[PDB]
Design an enzyme around this catalytic site. Structure first.
Site, PDB file in Angstrom:
ATOM      1  N   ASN A 206       1.051  -1.364  -0.149  1.00 28.33           N
ATOM      2  CA  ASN A 206      -0.222   0.179  -0.346  1.00 28.33           C
ATOM      3  C   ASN A 206       0.689   0.879   0.088  1.00 28.33           C
ATOM      4  OD1 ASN A 206      -2.039  -1.876   2.179  1.00 28.33           O
ATOM      5  ND2 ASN A 206      -2.676  -1.269   0.613  1.00 28.33           N
ATOM      6  N   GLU A 254      -1.861 -17.677 -22.391  1.00 28.03           N
ATOM      7  CA  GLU A 254      -1.468 -17.362 -23.443  1.00 28.03           C
ATOM      8  C   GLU A 254       0.162 -16.202 -22.794  1.00 28.03           C
ATOM      9  OE1 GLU A 254      -0.934 -17.944 -26.389  1.00 28.03           O
ATOM     10  OE2 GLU A 254      -2.848 -18.598 -26.736  1.00 28.03           O
TER      11      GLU A 254
END
Lengths: 439, 184, 432, 157
Positions: A206, A254
């Protein structure tokens, strides 16, 4: 066809989900009611929404994922919202007791109780679909709900489906700032499960979000909504070729096939661009070469690690919007000759070309402006191993005197798994340094 | 062919020096040749099988496709010379459950792929002359959990120099082999 | 009568085939509906080579689309000419190739191969006699490369007396798309050199450079490259599509242009590549086309033909000029540029003129030659495959499918043999 | 030259693999099975386990292995202006048998390891109570699938 099931564990997982769903509904023109009431002025929605939503016999869209949390407070918070008429209550399972940053209870005495229900739910969801490729598990390492319950569900999902892709998305404890104290205790055990039983894992914190929003968006009082918006934008960009088409469609398989050079090293470095605000997107000529160069800047990385410390083994780059191939080729020619960017002496090149005709859309009330095209990159480098080294050092200096361990002893576990996790992480770091060492 | 014949000790189905080494063998020739010449290493008559395609040049026994050998000896020993090319041979056998099964061993193979009717098979050929011993019973038991009954067909492909092919009840060392079975 | 069966593989192959079909429909006067709106004479007699006679004169295309991912048909059918093909030929699976050659050949190439074999056979017996089969695909993936080689092997086994010509796309280290592309190229080249009559080299980077530096396009895209390759194919096949005085055919070129079966690669190329503003200022003559078909600037190679010696050259023209100019041009080129072709074999240039001009352009002439320039591509491919195989990187995926590793060893073995053969034939000396 | 050079070439590649890999290992002192090279065949054994469990679990549950002979299709592209989809796989009725893969002893040793077991402490998954219980439970289906439990490594000539 190309359809997936998301999994949301913990309060963070639930909120990241909700952000993703609202982003997808607004981007496809999906109304919060669940139908298409726009009968006077159409504004879109005639596309292949089957990947994520489902079409009923009455013209209704049913969300497809898992909203599970051991604490009912988050479920109630979502329930009283304006989107309660969209999903189904059966998909939001409440709980009597919750982990709340504890692996012990949530993995043995709390998580083991609601297993059959979630298994039946996910089995029904899978049967409701025809083509399955992977999953989107959203959890956290700080959250006990997102660590123990997530680990036990993932271990069963792995042995129940070995032919399907297994993704991972969670939050990493930043070394500088944190929320709780026992975060390394949960992380050191969750890493073993996510390594020895999964295929890929995504690593973010964060504080990098805070740095980038202050530096570019220029906000003095940030909020979790913008963080969730950035994460949802990243997720949508990753799975962009699935909901739509393009010159070169890059499915989940892919890119995941090449994203893993080795089963032990499957921690890519994601980076989204452009992360800019409204005023930062008007007088700024945006091309592909500039943003691609900016993608390799450590200041724009979501992980605090200097890329110049190590070098790259493999890189996966994606695009979304009105991108012209000549610009991509020129950028490749520029970066391939860049001396600052480091790489091994055994991978002269590796990359993918994802051209998405549909441009990203904006949100009314958000901070992102109307950018004609977007770009996201997934690189693999050994310079990120510093985070694991620091975490191991932290766990060792917590573990010499056994701070906050008698609770875990009482809940009922072995003690040797701490040694097992420690030695496993040491071996992983040794493998990382071996890979990083050239001839 | 040898089902009703007394099988014990040795049972030679191919002898290079023999006047008609291929009386019970059928010849399949394409882009190759099968000739009996004199090997330089041993200075003896041998059967040479060569071809551009291994699968196109081979010999099979018995010559009659409808007939089977019916040899119950568990061990198959062949003395061949490595021509440093692709070589393979196939043996069809029968088990107790009355299933024909084929064992194909090739020098261009890595892992024994076990199929319900065929078992592909890797093997190594050292330079010069090699003595290949095949324990049909043990191979069958390992690959299918079945015991060996009799041999149905033996097929030897090209890129090899055959000296003698025979079956044995047990594995014979060089000393207990007869003079005609030794390689000088 | 004499007809040609066209085959499809790979999304790039699919799009280039669709572009070619649209180009030939436009040039022969076929409306997107399916009727005939042409106004020529030669576009009716030999029109049946690629079409089929049907009721009401509605000719149908003759091409089978083979793919593994459903996303391609939705793209190619939504186009202005996507509702005219035969939907039965669009044979597709449910799982993608994932740019894997071994997996696509093994997993997606067993339960899906039967349908395409059925349909191509029924098409074959639908006609009386055929010449060959055209398959346009790419080696950048698992769809075109993983399946076309199997399809070519099967059709060769079934019908040995046919033409196997293809226009696969060669990779390039500068412009890559797949991480394991060297592995796919190494696996495909063996089948190309073992069970394929002839193959032509196709590169995207060279076409991009050509358009950028000569055509001077604003935003060049794959559509431009598809148009170029479609025009190249039209120029190649017009020797049979549109007969003239000196007509030729595919097998003639294959026999004459190939000195040895192990070397059946070629070098294509079109002559008139001019910018938009240069179209209104150009001289339509022989020596200009001569220079544009001899120079390496207009050639679509990602290499230099000047590094070796010319082996076989075929000059196919399409227009109404003469014959004397071509022979005098080739004669003087061989006389002057004596250090660019095999001295041992004289007259390495073949003449072929199509009296029938193409539609839209008045003068056109392609270049089909086999020069000594692909050797560098082979050497760099071998070196990169050696580097990849040196540490066995990205191997568990192929390993996890079921195939072993000595396939790679025999592939690189044949590769070394081929490159040694090419280099020791490059210096084709007269004598000792 | 004839095919001897090709076998010798792959053998030299394996030998160089070894020499350099143990050079690197003894540079930093750790066993071969722990390192990058020798885990692939373990992954292959995992794929064999996957074959077994992916033939057994669809036998256990619904959808993934039902009778596909009468399963309909779908129309798409854009609302309705195109065509129906198709299913072209073992939907026909194909009965695919079971395959298995191992490797022999001396060949494995020359590859780099005489089938060394990995670290004794890592594999909690292989000894996971869930997998052990399923191995106890699914004996019926494991029998129904394949009765040929394999022993292979002792086969070299």
């Amino acid at each position: 066809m190309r359809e997936c099931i998301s999994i949301h564990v913990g309060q963070a997982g639930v909120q990241i989900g909700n952000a993703c769903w609202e982003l997808y509904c607004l981007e496809h023109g999906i109304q919060p009611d669940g139908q298409m009431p726009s009968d006077k002025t159409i504004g879109g929605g005639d596309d292949s929404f089957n990947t994520f939503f489902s079409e009923t016999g009455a013209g209704k869209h049913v969300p497809r994922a898992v909203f599970v949390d051991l604490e009912p407070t988050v479920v109630d918070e979502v329930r009283t919202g304006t989107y309660r008429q969209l999903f189904h209550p059966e998909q939001l399972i409440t709980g009597k007791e919750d982990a709340a940053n504890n692996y012990a209870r949530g993995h043995y005495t709390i998580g083991k109780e609601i297993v059959d229900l979630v298994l039946d739910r996910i089995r029904k969801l899978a049967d409701l679909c025809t083509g399955l490729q992977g999953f989107l598990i959203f959890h956290s390492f700080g959250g006990g709900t997102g660590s123990g319950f997530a680990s036990l569900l993932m271990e069963r999902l792995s042995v129940d489906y070995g032919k399907k892709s297994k993704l991972e998305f969670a939050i990493y404890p930043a070394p500088q700032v944190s929320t709780a104290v026992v975060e390394p205790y949960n992380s050191i055990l969750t890493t073993h499960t996510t390594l020895e039983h999964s295929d890929c894992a995504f690593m973010v914190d964060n504080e990098a979000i805070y740095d980038i929003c202050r530096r570019n968006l220029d906000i003095e009082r940030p909020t979790y909504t913008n963080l969730n918006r950035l994460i949802g934008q990243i997720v949508s960009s990753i799975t962009a070729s699935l909901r739509f088409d393009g010159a070169l469609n890059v499915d989940l398989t892919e890119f995941q096939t090449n994203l893993v050079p080795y089963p032990r090293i499957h921690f890519p470095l994601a980076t989204y661009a452009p992360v800019i605000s409204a005023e930062k997107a008007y007088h700024e000529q945006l091309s592909v070469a500039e943003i691609t160069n900016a993608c390799f800047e450590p200041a724009n990385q979501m992980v605090k690690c200097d890329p110049r410390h190590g070098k790259y083994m493999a890189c996966c780059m994606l695009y979304r919007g009105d991108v012209v191939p000549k610009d991509v080729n020129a950028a490749i020619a520029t970066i391939k000759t860049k001396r600052t960017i480091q790489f091994v002496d055994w991978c002269p090149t590796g990359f993918k070309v994802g051209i998405n005709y549909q441009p990203p859309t904006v949100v009314p009330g958000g901070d992102l402006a109307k950018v004609q095209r977007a770009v996201c990159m997934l690189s693999n480098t050994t310079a990120i191993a510093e985070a694991w080294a620091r975490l191991d050092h932290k766990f060792d200096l917590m573990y010499a005197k056994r701070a906050f361990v008698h609770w875990y002893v009482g809940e009922g576990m072995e003690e040797g798994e701490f040694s097992e996790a420690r030695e496993d992480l040491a071996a992983l770091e040794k493998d990382y340094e071996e890979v990083g060492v050239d001839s | 062919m040898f089902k009703n014949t007394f099988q014990s000790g040795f049972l030679s189905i191919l002898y290079s020096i023999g006047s008609k080494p291929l009386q019970i063998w059928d010849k399949k020739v394409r882009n190759g040749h099968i000739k009996r010449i004199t090997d330089n290493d041993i200075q003896s008559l041998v059967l040479e099988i060569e071809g551009t395609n291994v699968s196109t040049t081979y010999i099979t026994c018995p010559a009659d496709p409808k007939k089977t050998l019916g040899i119950k000896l568990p061990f198959l020993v062949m003395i061949i010379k490595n021509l440093k090319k692709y070589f393979t041979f196939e043996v069809q056998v029968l088990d107790d459950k009355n299933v024909r099964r084929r064992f194909r061993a090739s020098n261009y193979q890595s892992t024994t792929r076990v199929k319900p009717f065929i078992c592909t098979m890797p093997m190594r050929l050292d330079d010069g002359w090699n003595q290949i011993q095949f324990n049909l019973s043990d191979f069958t038991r390992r690959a299918y959990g079945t015991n060996y009954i009799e041999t149905l067909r033996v097929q030897i492909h090209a890129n090899c120099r055959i000296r003698r092919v025979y079956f044995s009840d047990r594995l014979y060392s060089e000393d207990e082999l007869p003079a005609e079975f030794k390689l000088y | 009568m004499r007809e040609i069966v066209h085959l499809q593989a790979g999304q790039c192959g699919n799009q280039i085939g669709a572009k070619f079909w649209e180009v030939i429909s436009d040039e022969h006067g076929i409306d997107p509906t399916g009727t005939y709106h042409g106004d020529s004479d030669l576009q009716l007699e030999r029109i049946n080579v690629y079409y089929n006679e049907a009721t009401g004169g509605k000719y149908v295309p003759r091409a089978v689309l083979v793919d593994l991912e459903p996303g391609t048909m939705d793209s190619v059918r939504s186009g202005p000419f996507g509702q005219i093909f035969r939907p039965d030929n669009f044979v597709f699976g449910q799982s993608g190739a994932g740019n894997n050659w071994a997996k696509g050949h093994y997993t997606e190439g067993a339960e899906l191969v039967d349908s395409v074999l059925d349909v191509v056979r029924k098409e074959a017996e639908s006609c009386d006699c055929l010449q060959g089969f055209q398959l346009t695909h790419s080696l950048g993936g698992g769809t075109g490369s993983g399946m076309g080689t199997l399809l070519i092997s099967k059709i060769r086994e079934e019908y040995p007396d046919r033409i196997m010509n293809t226009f696969s796309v060669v990779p390039s280290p500068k412009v890559s798309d797949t991480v394991v592309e060297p592995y796919n190229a190494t696996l495909s080249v063996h089948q190309l050199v073992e069970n394929t009559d002839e193959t032509y080299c196709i590169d995207n980077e060279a076409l991009y450079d050509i358009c950028f530096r000569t055509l001077k396009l604003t935003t060049p895209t794959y559509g431009d490259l598809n148009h170029l390759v479609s025009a190249t194919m039209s120029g190649v096949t017009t020797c049979l599509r549109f007969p003239g005085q000196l007509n030729a055919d595919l097998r003639k070129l294959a026999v004459n242009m190939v000195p040895f079966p192990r070397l059946h690669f070629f070098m294509p190329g079109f002559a008139p590549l001019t910018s938009r503003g240069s179209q209104q200022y150009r001289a339509l003559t022989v020596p200009e086309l001569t220079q544009q078909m001899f120079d390496a600037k207009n050639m679509m190679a990602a290499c230099d033909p000047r590094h070796g010696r010319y082996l076989t050259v075929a000059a196919v023209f399409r227009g109404r000029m003469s014959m004397k100019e071509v022979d005098e041009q080739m004669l003087n080129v061989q006389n002057k540029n004596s250090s660019y072709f095999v001295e041992w074999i004289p007259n390495n240039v073949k003449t072929a003129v199509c009296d029938i001009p193409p539609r839209g352009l008045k003068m056109s002439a392609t270049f089909i030659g086999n020069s000594t320039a692909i050797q560098e591509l082979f050497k760099r491919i071998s070196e990169q495959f050696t580097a990849m195989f040196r540490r066995k990187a990205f191997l568990h995926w192929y390993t996890g499918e079921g195939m072993d590793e000595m396939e790679f060893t025999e592939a690189e073995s044949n590769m070394n043999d081929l490159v040694s053969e090419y280099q020791q034939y490059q210096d084709a000396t007269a004598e000792e | 030259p004839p095919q001897h050079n090709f076998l010798k070439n792959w053998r030299r590649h394996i030998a160089l693999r070894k020499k350099q890999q143990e050079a690197l290992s003894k540079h930093l002192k750790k066993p071969a099975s722990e390192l990058l090279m020798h885990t692939g065949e373990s992954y292959r054994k995992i794929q064999e386990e996957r074959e077994v469990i992916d033939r057994a679990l669809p036998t256990q549950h619904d959808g993934k292995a039902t009778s596909w002979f009468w399963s309909p299709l779908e129309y798409l592209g854009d609302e309705m202006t195109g065509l129906l989809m198709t299913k072209k796989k073992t939907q026909r009725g194909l009965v695919e048998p079971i395959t298995h893969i191992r490797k022999p002893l001396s060949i494995q040793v020359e590859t780099g390891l005489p089938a060394q077991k990995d670290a004794w402490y890592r594999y909690t998954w292989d000894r996971s109570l869930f997998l052990i219980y399923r191995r106890k439970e699914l004996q019926s289906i494991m029998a129904e699938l394949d009765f040929s439990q394999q022993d292979i490594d002792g086969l070299e000539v």
